[PDB]
Design a protein around this ligand. Sequence first.
Ligand SMILES: Nc1ncnc2c1ncn2[C@@H]1O[C@H](COP(=O)(O)OP(=O)(O)O)[C@@H](O)[C@H]1O
Ligand SMILES: NC(=[NH2+])NCCC[C@H](N)C(=O)O
Ligand SMILES: [Mg+2]
Length: 356
Amino acid sequence: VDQATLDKLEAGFKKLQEASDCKSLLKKHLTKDVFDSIKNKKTGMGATLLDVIQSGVENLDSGVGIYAPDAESYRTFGPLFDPIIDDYHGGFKLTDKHPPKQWGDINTLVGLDPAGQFIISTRVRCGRSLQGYPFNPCLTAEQYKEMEEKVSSTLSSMEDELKGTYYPLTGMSKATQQQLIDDHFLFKEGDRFLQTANACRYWPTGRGIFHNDAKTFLVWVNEEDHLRIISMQKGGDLKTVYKRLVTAVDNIESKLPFSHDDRFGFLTFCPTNLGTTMRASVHIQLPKLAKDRKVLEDIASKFNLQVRGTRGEHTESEGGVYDISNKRRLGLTEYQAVREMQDGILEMIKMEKAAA
Ligand SMILES: Nc1ncnc2c1ncn2[C@@H]1O[C@H](COP(=O)(O)OP(=O)(O)O)[C@@H](O)[C@H]1O
Ligand SMILES: NC(=[NH2+])NCCC[C@H](N)C(=O)O
Ligand SMILES: [Mg+2]
């Protein structure tokens, strides 16, 4: 690592230390002991510690604040990643390893709010990274297009309920893009956390969305992860939403090789998405409990749930609609992750019903 980068690293570390309003896992876990032991290391593709932490240093309102520029980073910068991973996912020791993939018995899942009194819509997503390619900060324009081609060709072979069309972002009018974002289907553009991680280079080249006609099955191409695979619909029928996702993922996996790690499970760009990579969420109205976002978040955390705004993370609630989802993704099976969301939401609804 050259001196120019070391100087920037030193400057970055001091900013973290001195920022007392900062509450990120990066600030918590990047001690001088940890920093000194990894600050001179470099991965095989040239990623340095600066590439890992810069988003967290530039955005002190970060909750996590680090990203993996390549797969090797998870090990090279292990002394930083490991404790953050343990903290975020609720206990994952140096000796732990993520369990093998297990979708579980779908028939044991339930519809969440049959009367339709609370839940507006249910969504389950996973992330996948393609074998042989690095994460966003290390990709060339040529690689973004090559991956786009590989993925869109594969998706063109989906059938039946999952048959759909691929829409590149480059070919999309501003009006169409905005409508798809407003209706919760498409990823937003210009995320400052991703931008400062050097994760949006060459935008919008190689980025797009695949979906079926009903927009119940969607795939995002080259946003935060190489693939995000999404099943969603109005109402609370988690069993149907999840079953569609399982079918889609199993189908795609037989056609595209994904990066899997013996310890971390499926590899992703942000460590909060490792393992199952699963985020199962509802858009839900809890008028009595959500009088105060703070009390809502406190209750949620008791059930290992996270709370996000209506348009996704780092947004506000619109009309009292919150996004509530399982927080943990590593160290438990896919079935356990979707169960943690189902069981927690059922308890939160019970609490809402008894609330004054
Ligand atoms: N249960 C849900 N129903 C409808 N839209 C949702 C739901 N959960 C998340 N979303 C939408 O998904 C999009 C992505 O939000 P984000 O917080 O970045 O999640 P992700 O982990 O999929 O990237 C946003 O438009 C958000 O409104
Ligand atoms: N999509 C994600 N990886 N979200 C979690 C991290 C987002 C942002 N970097 C933060 O530290 O708050
Ligand atoms: Mg997102």
